[PDB]
Amino acid sequence: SKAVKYYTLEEIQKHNNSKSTWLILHYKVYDLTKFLEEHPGGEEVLREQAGGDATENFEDVGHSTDARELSKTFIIGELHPDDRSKIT
Ligand code: HEM
């Protein structure tokens, strides 16, 4: 169970609500569904970014090393290589 899992942006855009909230950070895909109520910055800022890239939003508000480590709980795979050029 160690092989990479790729998701297309097309698929990621469908996961946009509290039953299944995904987003992308630095080409990695996270399922934050069980994190929404735990996030110190609140649920809304996460819901607003669901189904897309939130890398600049994440980096712009100075997330700590502790935040970066914690994000590993929610990683489900990587952005498909063919979609990485869409993330600007
Ligand atoms: C999987 C990713 C995320 C995790 C694990 C996470 C975790 C955390 C943690 C632990 C904090 C407390 C402060 C810190 O340790 O830096 C925090 C604060 C915050 N986060 Fe996140 N965060 C994530 C994604 C995001 C995203 C995508 C946004 C923006 C859309 C966001 C917006 C904020 C804001 C605004 C605060 C509050 C800052 C403050 O008032 O001091 N976070 N986050």
* Structural domain spans, the chain: 1-88
Residues 6+ apart with CB under 8 A from 55: 24, 25, 26, 87
- Is the beta carbon of 21 within 6 A of some atom in ligand 1? no
- In angstroms, what is the resolution? 1.5
69 lines ligand 1 (CB under 6 A): no
The answer regarding whether domain 1-88 maps to CATH 3.40.50.2000 reads no
Binding residues, by number, are: 39, 63
Which residue has a Cα nearest atom 7 of ligand 1? 67
Technique used to solve these coordinates: X-ray
